[PDB]
Write an enzyme that holds these catalytic residues in place. Sequence first.
Site, PDB file in Angstrom:
ATOM      1  N   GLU A   5       0.816  -1.209   0.000  1.00 51.50           N
ATOM      2  CA  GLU A   5       0.000   0.000   0.000  1.00 51.50           C
ATOM      3  C   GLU A   5       0.852   1.263   0.000  1.00 51.50           C
ATOM      4  OE1 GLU A   5      -3.055  -0.501  -0.522  1.00 51.50           O
ATOM      5  OE2 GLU A   5      -3.400  -2.560   0.145  1.00 51.50           O
TER       6      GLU A   5
ATOM      7  N   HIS B 183     -15.815  -9.288  -6.526  1.00 56.69           N
ATOM      8  CA  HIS B 183     -15.673  -8.433  -7.700  1.00 56.69           C
ATOM      9  C   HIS B 183     -16.843  -8.586  -8.661  1.00 56.69           C
ATOM     10  CE1 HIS B 183     -11.640  -9.046  -6.027  1.00 56.69           C
ATOM     11  NE2 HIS B 183     -11.346  -7.850  -6.504  1.00 56.69           N
TER      12      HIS B 183
HETATM   13 ZN   LIG Z   1      -2.940  -2.571  -3.564  1.00 57.87          ZN
END
Ligand SMILES: [Zn+2]
Lengths: 193, 596
Positions: B357, B487
């Site tokens: 991240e 998803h």
């Molecule tokens: Zn990511």
Amino acid sequence: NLCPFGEVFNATKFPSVYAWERKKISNCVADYSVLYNSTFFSTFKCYGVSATKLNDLCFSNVYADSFVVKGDDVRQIAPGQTGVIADYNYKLPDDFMGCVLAWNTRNIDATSTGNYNYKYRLFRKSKLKPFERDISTEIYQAGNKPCNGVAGSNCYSPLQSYGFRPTYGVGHQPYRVVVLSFELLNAPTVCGP
Amino acid sequence: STIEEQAKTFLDKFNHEAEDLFYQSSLASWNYNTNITEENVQNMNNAGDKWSAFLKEQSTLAQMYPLQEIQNLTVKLQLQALQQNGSSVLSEDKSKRLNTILNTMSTIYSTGKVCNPDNPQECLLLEPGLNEIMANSLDYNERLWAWESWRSEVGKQLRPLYEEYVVLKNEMARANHYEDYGDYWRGDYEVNGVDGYDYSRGQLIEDVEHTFEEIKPLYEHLHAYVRAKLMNAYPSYISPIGCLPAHLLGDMWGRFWTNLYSLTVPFGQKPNIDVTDAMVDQAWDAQRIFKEAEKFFVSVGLPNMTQGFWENSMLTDPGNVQKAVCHPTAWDLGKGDFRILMCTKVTMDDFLTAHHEMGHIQYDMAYAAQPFLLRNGANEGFHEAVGEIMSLSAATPKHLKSIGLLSPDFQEDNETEINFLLKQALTIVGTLPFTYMLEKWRWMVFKGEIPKDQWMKKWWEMKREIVGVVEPVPHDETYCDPASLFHVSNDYSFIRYYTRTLYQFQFQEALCQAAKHEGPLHKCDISNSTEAGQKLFNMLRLGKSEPWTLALENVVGAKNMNVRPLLNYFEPLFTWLKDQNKNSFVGWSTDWSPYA
Ligand SMILES: [Zn+2]
Ligand SMILES: *[C@@H]1O[C@H](CO)[C@@H](O[C@@H]2O[C@H](CO)[C@@H](O[C@@H]3O[C@H](CO)[C@@H](O)[C@H](O)[C@@H]3O)[C@H](O)[C@H]2NC(C)=O)[C@H](O)[C@H]1NC(C)=O
Ligand SMILES: *[C@@H]1O[C@H](CO)[C@@H](O[C@@H]2O[C@H](CO)[C@@H](O[C@@H]3O[C@H](CO)[C@@H](O)[C@H](O)[C@@H]3O)[C@H](O)[C@H]2NC(C)=O)[C@H](O)[C@H]1NC(C)=O
Ligand SMILES: *[C@@H]1O[C@H](CO)[C@@H](O[C@@H]2O[C@H](CO)[C@@H](O)[C@H](O)[C@H]2NC(C)=O)[C@H](O)[C@H]1NC(C)=O
Ligand SMILES: *[C@@H]1O[C@H](CO)[C@@H](O[C@@H]2O[C@H](CO)[C@@H](O)[C@H](O)[C@H]2NC(C)=O)[C@H](O)[C@H]1NC(C)=O
Ligand SMILES: *[C@@H]1O[C@H](CO)[C@@H](O[C@@H]2O[C@H](CO)[C@@H](O)[C@H](O)[C@H]2NC(C)=O)[C@H](O)[C@H]1NC(C)=O
Ligand SMILES: *[C@@H]1O[C@H](CO)[C@@H](O)[C@H](O)[C@H]1NC(C)=O
Ligand SMILES: [Cl-]
């Protein structure tokens, strides 16, 4: 009698960059041990003369201009820039002789809801001449449309306001900026023994 | 003033007017995802509705300038994105109905609970209930219940909602000058106008298959190896020639086969390079994990994390006093505000997740100089390829001992490298036929090729044929097992995870090559290489301005995605896999079912 530099720096409220203010200083002794003996500034970059032997120098009159600009746009308070502020808000001459000062003011110029008081001009026909100032709020014509005093399609209100939030980055943070212009003339003020 | 000049001053007014509304809308979405209150969830939607209302207003104002008149490549792209009629191209009621069914699919997916027939007082939802079973359980019946219950309970509730979701989304795509919704999603990879770099929505289907065709041999050997190991954990349950049952695949959907490592470990006698014990026993905290992360990026030539990132990011579980979401995310609020939200635990998994991240933030910090509409990855699969390159370099045992979590006397045998590549293979290559087959089915459904009377019947034809997985219990059209994945039920395109896997190894190979790396590609740590950093930085700053094909060239030197870096990364495992199948059957018969 002392020059009132504190009246332009330590002032309570500062103006918007598009409607910046100037203050002419005349006959008075100038103690510059307030500025160089200070790590409080975030810029302090001079032009035309050194930062220390200005104590023993004299000018006809000194012009102190002050305003507020985002942290990123402080880059433009230098001779010969072509950003949004330098072109439409505050242009400096290529023969500028003086110093530029700036210090972060996130604590007092940024609020939780966003301080929208500080504004800048985004649209303007033709650049600004050095030291020119425009408080115009006319509806800017971007297309071929008459605006009829109304804004909208191809007519954009020229002024945009910073939304100074205290959690912004260093670049998008408020910086009070005071620019000290030095006027020279063959006429007979601001020394410092 | 020309048509181009008016559009430019329109973009000038838009950028400075969009920057302030995006920050207010993103701060409100941060106030909810870090502090679940009814005051902040209304604060979220009001700033989010103002942002969308500003967009649909500006969407029409962007249509004021016809695209055919613009020769400036940057202004042309920005006007194109803003003029996307999108959901606004539907009628009032049909669009409102579409928004309703999109939330309910998200709701019944996030709130669907299956109840135990043995103990009806205990009812579990997907996280942590069903996922913990599918990941840790070894009982065939228990895994069969958890796998089937989620598909016969939540997936069955999703079946009528997904049928209507397809037709309404098709009305949006065709009215926006598209063939289907799968054509709409493939438009992310589209480059139209630049000479020599063009790339069509049809080009994606061709290239993904051409690379997938060359991915089959490695996967076929990884399948045969994993299959034989699974026959030992479930005797008389798996045919040595048939496909793998869908419920024995590691998680609820078989997306990643990581949890089969305890069963498929080549050399279990070796000590694992998992330094989770070292992180807990050294009193490391969430601060140490992320300050060590920042140290990694700087030592490669990239800038620090902002002070706004330090004071305002949420790096721990907010405790019993504050209820919040704990999905690891990297936030780019704009106006130079970058943050990371992660309820960090002091484990090895978080040390690698912290680097993932934070790679997003470095990508975000780089293209912040681009205009507002171009502050995004080159395509949908670019950002997650950056986050995984950090996870790749930070996972090498040399990088572990350079940080202080692995002892200097860890000997890197050809076994511990095979253990690691097999460990990386179960999660990387195992998801590629899954990702392809999934989007391949979605593309066909949106294309209308699979009628509603054989949705599930065709779905499992491709499951056995492409990925090599068979259903444990027969499913009719009442199920909707595609929508049983996040998803699919939450309107996220899925081909980006295949393309990111191909992008990431092209990046890592070229960056390790620039770092003068010599040994095996999987043994590469990028730290201390300021040369390779500026190489990658040449692409991070471009954002969405440059075509994704051009931005890919600035780092890898290629115009299109390539599988050879993926193949070369797994080359020690592929040859060893060829050996382990010398007396084993590679490939699968599509006709074998674990039932009658
Ligand atoms: Zn990511
Ligand atoms: C804005 O207000 C501040 C504080 O009221 C002013 O700073 C003050 O400046 C004086 C004089 O420079 C400092 O006094 C002392 O001066 C002697 C001179 O010999 C020196 O030896 C001492 O070390 C000391 O500097 C005073 O300490 C200083 N205070 C602070 C908090 O900085 C400032 O001058 C005002 N702004 C302007 C533009 O004048
Ligand atoms: C499309 O139009 C944009 C208009 O923004 C063009 O980009 C701009 O091009 C000008 C001309 O070179 C750049 O001006 C330069 O600014 C720097 C700032 O440091 C200054 O030092 C230079 O003297 C010069 O004035 C401007 O930066 C640039 N802006 C952006 C955002 O790129 C662009 O070139 C046009 N593209 C095409 C294909 O027509
Ligand atoms: C969590 O959110 C609430 C609002 O959703 C924040 O505001 C608190 O509640 C009222 C709201 O007007 C104020 O009077 C309180 O003073 C606020 N603070 C506290 C501690 O109750 C609250 O600040 C948020 N919490 C955090 C940690 O950000
Ligand atoms: C990146 O940030 C780190 C902060 O950890 C910088 O380290 C500096 O080094 C000394 C020694 O600890 C501190 O006294 C400084 O205050 C640190 N700087 C800051 C901003 O905290 C490091 O120099 C930074 N490097 C780059 C390239 O930005
Ligand atoms: C990159 O080179 C530097 C050169 O100092 C290495 O930094 C030292 O190495 C060990 C671990 O390898 C640390 O315990 C020391 O504290 C580091 N020194 C300082 C001042 O922090 C660094 O390890 C190298 N990184 C690699 C090879 O990946
Ligand atoms: C958007 O839809 C309107 C009609 O609703 C149409 O006139 C316009 O051309 C469309 N614009 C784009 C970019 O599709
Ligand atoms: Cl499935």
